[PDB]
Amino acid sequence: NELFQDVLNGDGESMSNTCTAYLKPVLNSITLATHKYDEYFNEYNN
Amino acid sequence: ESPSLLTVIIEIAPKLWTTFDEEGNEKGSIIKVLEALIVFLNAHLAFNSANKVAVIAAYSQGIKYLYPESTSALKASRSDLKIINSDMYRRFRNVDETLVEEIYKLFELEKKQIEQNSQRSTLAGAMSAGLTYVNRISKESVTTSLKSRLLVLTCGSGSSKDEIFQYIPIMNCIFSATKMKCPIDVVKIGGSKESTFLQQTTDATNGVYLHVESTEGLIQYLATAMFIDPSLRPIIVKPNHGSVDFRTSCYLTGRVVAVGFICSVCLCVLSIIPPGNKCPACDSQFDEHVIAKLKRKPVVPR
Amino acid sequence: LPVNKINKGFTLVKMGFPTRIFEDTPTFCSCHSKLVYGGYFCPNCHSKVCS
Amino acid sequence: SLKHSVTQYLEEIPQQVQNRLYTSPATCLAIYRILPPLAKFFIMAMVFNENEVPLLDLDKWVNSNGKLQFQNAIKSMKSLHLLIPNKSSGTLMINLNPTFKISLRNALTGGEVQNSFGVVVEENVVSLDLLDEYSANKWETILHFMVGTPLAKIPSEKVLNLLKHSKLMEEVNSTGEFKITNEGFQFLLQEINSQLWTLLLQYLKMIETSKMDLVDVLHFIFMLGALEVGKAYKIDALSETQRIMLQDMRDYGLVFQKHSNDSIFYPTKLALMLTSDTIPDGSLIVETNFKIYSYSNSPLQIAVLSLFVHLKARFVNMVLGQITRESIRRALTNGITADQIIAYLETHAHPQMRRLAEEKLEKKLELDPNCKEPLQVLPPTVVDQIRLWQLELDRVITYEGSLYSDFETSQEYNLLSKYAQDIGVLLWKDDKKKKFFISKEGNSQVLDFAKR
Amino acid sequence: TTLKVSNQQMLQQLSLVMDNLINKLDLNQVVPNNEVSNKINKRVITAIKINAKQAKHNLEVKSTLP
Ligand SMILES: [Zn+2]
Ligand SMILES: [Zn+2]
Ligand SMILES: [Zn+2]
């Protein structure tokens, strides 16, 4: 997210979408991993 | 540039086409698909002077070579029936007359053997026979550099569902066609939009998949998208929309498989751990220690 | 090679069947960290591979 | 080669004559078989739909790896007048030729074809025993006439005028013999299908009289390409112009007739070979001592080898000959270049010479892999000797024209020399000698420049 | 997992195909009426456009980023 806002206020959104889409699958995969972690944590809490 | 061989595998079944006629508004769609195929074969023979045509029909009780005729049948014959007009080009006329004569004979055989209803579709065996004929025309090598292309005109009509017995023969035909560089185009006439095995056949063998719902205007589909010659295959894009996922069905549940487990002995795909800790296909007993690790629940602190 | 009868390593092997992702924008693959248009997203963790 | 010649000839046809040529379905089918595969694919996808197809849609068909070829196909459809462009809604819409589309659809589906493919009369003879023998007999007759060997039977004056008025096969009446040109030995080089095509296009070039109609000749040639051997066809569908030119190719050998002006005519194998094609005889062994062991039994190969090989003995299998200086001088006095002779000796080379050359090149590559050499199937000594004899024929080249000199001022000489260079007729000039030379055809231009 | 025809109407449809093959197989009936051909052309061109936009582009490729 820091790199996304850095390219946002550096390149001014003309090239920030390309930077986001380049790292989009790894962001989605780590988001899915954190979601699975939180789901199993909440499952064991209950 | 280079002549090619067009081997046509048409699946004509009296039960399959009757369902399509009942679902559709029109009747006798066999005549429409046959005349569209005849015009398409005349178009292919017009493309080059040295191209060849093979037509094989898969009926309920087996398969039979529509064109060319059997060499015993050719030696036995010639009653020139007037199904096709005689004033056309003789190269087209011989192929068309032979094709319609063998349609006549095969439908007489179907009418004779209509009492027995077969639950075994012979489309995959017909594709295998077409591959053998393609190898023969390549192996015979009478003509330099003959190329080749399979075109399977099948019909589902919303009645015949997915056939799991066909899976291994269709995959073997895919590997054989990939080995001999023979593209496989498939035209499906019926209400079933998705045919997973035939879509995999078109995708893996660099063929074109085309599903249609009406037999009218079929020659407009064939001469436009199925007329991709093997000489011009890489320079023409393929309109085969609806990309297949290349997945497979589970063995004991039948559903399309997610992340799952297969038997290390017989490669059968299981969506879940089978009961009894034994493979349902090859009866191999699984170790209880290793499958507990698969059954082991993932870890996270409290 | 045909295996011996004494071999009892008949273990289930876990794998997933990925889907060929289609995109007109190049993305970093998880295996080589290079810009590849196509790929295969992992059915378990949604990570893409080249081959 | 073959498709390029008929493509360029059909380019020269006027557009109204081209559209009149699209009436018969057989002509349209034979023309369609000449087109490139992308062009054939676009035409075949475009016939069966009556609505016009945009050019941008056709551009989306082709992958990026063959787009240039697509343009070439379009160029062919921009040359043969099959695709009519239209400017509609800011788009370059493309429409198919209606007569061509209708005739091609009638050829494919069957129907009204006005007997463009003829009618079978069901009476037939053996093709190999008679029809192949008659066509080969006429072809060997005309070829043995044109190579210059003596013949007991000579072909008729219809083809003698054909050979006289052609660019090849020059004739002289002061001696009484026929001289082969460079184009003649070129004609002996390629395979017989494009030989027949070159003959037929030269015949098409000669036909301007009111006795003969050009469209009927093109229709008849294309249906002869469409006819099949081993089955006769009736003459009644043909016109009287078509009847007399049917007799003309009966003399030529493309078609067989049992008697003159018969009701039927038998197509030959040359008719089907007119469309497309499909150790050997004439295979030769060249040695360092210039001995030719040419495994030929047909008189055609022996006769064409006699143009440049001093034949010594004849066996059933080969003809024992030798490449001498005098025989090569005989070949070069007929204008047959050394490159044509070397190409002929390369194309008819023995498989054993090919194996020896392959072994030599295999020893060469394992010795010097830094450079690659062409597969010299025949020894380089005889090639060098052939080129040396070619050089000693042309040690002097004679240009006839006029030399202008004796200029008192250098400026006038410079002006005349630069004028001659601008009109492209000067060959040599020198201000030190004050002389400049011009060719024979460029004399009169400088004459009217100087007089006026 | 995520209308069976009787043999009588089966034979009637087969005999209908038989008599439609006896009388005249007019191949010129394959020509569309220029209305369905428009729909077929639109479907094929849309599929071609989708596949060509997908397969326009497919050592890593060059990027617009510095
Ligand atoms: Zn198993
Ligand atoms: Zn990678
Ligand atoms: Zn993964």
Answer whether C13's CB lies under 8 Å from E45's CB: no
Q: Ligand 1 center to residue B269 CA distance, Å?
A: 9
* A29/C35 touch (CB, cutoff 8 Å), yes or no: no
Answer whether D197's CB lies under 8 Å from D218's CB: no
Q: Using CB atoms, which chains have 3+ pairs under 8 A with D?
A: B, E
Neighbours of B146 (CB within 10 A): 19
Instruction: Choose the closest CB to B287 out of C10, C20, C22.
Output: C10
- Chain B partners of C13 at a C-beta cutoff of 8 Å? 261-262, 264
Identify the three-state secondary structure at position D105: helix
Instruction: Choose the closest CB to E55 out of B17, B100, B237.
Output: B237
Q: Which residue has the tokens 């009787």?
A: E6
Alpha carbon B228 to its chain centroid, in Å, reads 17
Q: Ligand 1 center to residue C10 CA distance, Å?
A: 9
- CB contacts < 8 A, B to D, total 98
Q: Which amino acid is at D253?
A: G
* B261/C9 touch (CB, cutoff 8 Å), yes or no: no
Answer whether E32's CB lies under 8 Å from D48's CB: yes
* E16/B19 touch (CB, cutoff 8 Å), yes or no: no
Kindly state whether E17 is in contact with chain B, defined as any CB-CB distance less than 8 angstroms. Answer: yes
Neighbouring C-alpha atoms within 13 Å toward the C-beta of D274: 31
- Chain C partners of E54 at a C-beta cutoff of 8 Å? 22, 24
Kindly state whether B253 is in contact with chain E, defined as any CB-CB distance less than 8 angstroms. Answer: yes
* Helix segments in B144-234, DSSP class H: 167-179, 196-204, 218-225
Neighbours of B76 (CB within 10 A): 9
Q: Ligand 1 center to residue C8 CA distance, Å?
A: 13
CA nearest neighbour of B275 among B260, B285, B262, B290: B285
Q: Which residue has the tokens 């060059």?
A: E62
As given in the structure block, the two tokens for residue D167 are: 């660019």
Kindly state whether D63 is in contact with chain B, defined as any CB-CB distance less than 8 angstroms. Answer: yes
Sign of the C-alpha dihedral, residues D245, D248, D252, D254? positive
Helices (H) and strands (E) counted in chain D, each on its own, are 21, 15
Sign of the C-alpha dihedral, residues B7, B196, B234, C49? negative
Identify the three-state secondary structure at position B217: coil
Rg of chain B (C-alpha set)? 22
- The Cα diameter of chain E in Å comes to 74
Identify the three-state secondary structure at position B296: coil
* E63/C38 touch (CB, cutoff 8 Å), yes or no: no
In whole angstroms, what is the distance from residue D83 CA to residue D63 CA? 21
In whole angstroms, what is the distance from residue B268 CA to residue B250 CA? 8
In whole angstroms, what is the distance from residue D240 CA to residue D210 CA? 13
As given in the structure block, the two tokens for residue D221 are: 């040639």
Sign of the C-alpha dihedral, residues B42, B47, B52, B54? negative
- Chain B partners of E7 at a C-beta cutoff of 8 Å? 114-115, 117
In whole angstroms, what is the distance from residue A21 CA to residue A38 CA? 25
Residues 6+ apart with CB under 8 A from D4: none
Strand-pairing partners, residue D404, are D436
- Chain B partners of E50 at a C-beta cutoff of 8 Å? 241
Sign of the C-alpha dihedral, residues B166, B172, B178, B180? negative
Strand-pairing partners, residue B189, are B155, B212
CA nearest neighbour of B152 among B232, B211, B68, B204: B211
In whole angstroms, what is the distance from residue D49 CA to residue E30 CA? 11
Kindly state whether D112 is in contact with chain E, defined as any CB-CB distance less than 8 angstroms. Answer: no
In whole angstroms, what is the distance from residue B171 CA to residue D98 CA? 45
B189, with CB counted inside 10 A (0-12, 13-18, 19+), is buried
In whole angstroms, what is the distance from residue D275 CA to residue C42 CA? 56
In whole angstroms, what is the distance from residue D26 CA to residue D31 CA? 8
| Residue of chain B whose alpha carbon sits nearest to that of E22 | B83
**Residue D376: left if φ>0, alpha if ψ -120 to 50, beta else—which one?**
beta
| Residue of chain B whose alpha carbon sits nearest to that of D28 | B46
* E57/C37 touch (CB, cutoff 8 Å), yes or no: yes
> According to the entry, how was the structure determined?
cryo-EM
Kindly state whether C38 is in contact with chain B, defined as any CB-CB distance less than 8 angstroms. Answer: no
In whole angstroms, what is the distance from residue B249 CA to residue B251 CA? 7
Residues 6+ apart with CB under 8 A from B204: B174, B178, B246
CA nearest neighbour of B236 among D66, D47, D40, E56: D66
Q: Ligand 1 center to residue D317 CA distance, Å?
A: 68
Q: Ligand 1 center to residue B165 CA distance, Å?
A: 17
CA nearest neighbour of C28 among A30, A16, A25: A25
- The Cα diameter of chain C in Å comes to 52
In whole angstroms, what is the distance from residue B222 CA to residue B35 CA? 12
Identify the three-state secondary structure at position D160: helix
Kindly state whether D51 is in contact with chain B, defined as any CB-CB distance less than 8 angstroms. Answer: no
Query: Angle at which helices D214-226 and D25-32 pack, to 10 degrees?
Result: 70
Q: Which amino acid is at D14?
A: P
D374, with CB counted inside 10 A (0-12, 13-18, 19+), is exposed
As given in the structure block, the two tokens for residue D248 are: 């003309």
Return residues with CB closer than 5 A to ligand 1 (ion). Answer: B 263, 265-266, 279, 281-282, 284
8-state DSSP, E60: P
Q: Which amino acid is at A27?
A: L
- What's phi and psi for E21, nearest 5 deg? -85, -25
Q: Which amino acid is at D142?
A: I
Tally the residues of chain A. Answer: 46
Touch test C–A: 3 Cβ pairs or more under 8 Å: yes
Neighbours of D343 (CB within 10 A): 14
Identify the three-state secondary structure at position A13: coil
Sign of the C-alpha dihedral, residues B264, B268, B269, B275? negative
Taking the CA of C43 as reference, the closest ligand is: 3
In whole angstroms, what is the distance from residue D364 CA to residue B152 CA? 52
Touch test B–D: 3 Cβ pairs or more under 8 Å: yes
In whole angstroms, what is the distance from residue D297 CA to residue D292 CA? 14
In whole angstroms, what is the distance from residue B15 CA to residue E5 CA? 7
Strand-pairing partners, residue D25, are none
Q: Which residue has the tokens 């794998």?
A: C15
Touch test C–E: 3 Cβ pairs or more under 8 Å: yes
To which CATH superfamily is domain B4-226 assigned? von Willebrand factor, type A domain (3.40.50.410)
In whole angstroms, what is the distance from residue D336 CA to residue D390 CA? 10
Identify the three-state secondary structure at position B120: coil
What residues of E are in the A interface, CB distance below 8 Å?
Answer: 63-65
| Residue of chain A whose alpha carbon sits nearest to that of C25 | A21
* E41/D110 touch (CB, cutoff 8 Å), yes or no: no
CA distances from D237 to B92, C10, D117, D118, D263 (A): 21, 80, 10, 7, 10
Shortest Cα–Cα distance, E61 to chain B (Å): 21
- What's phi and psi for D329, nearest 5 deg? -65, -40
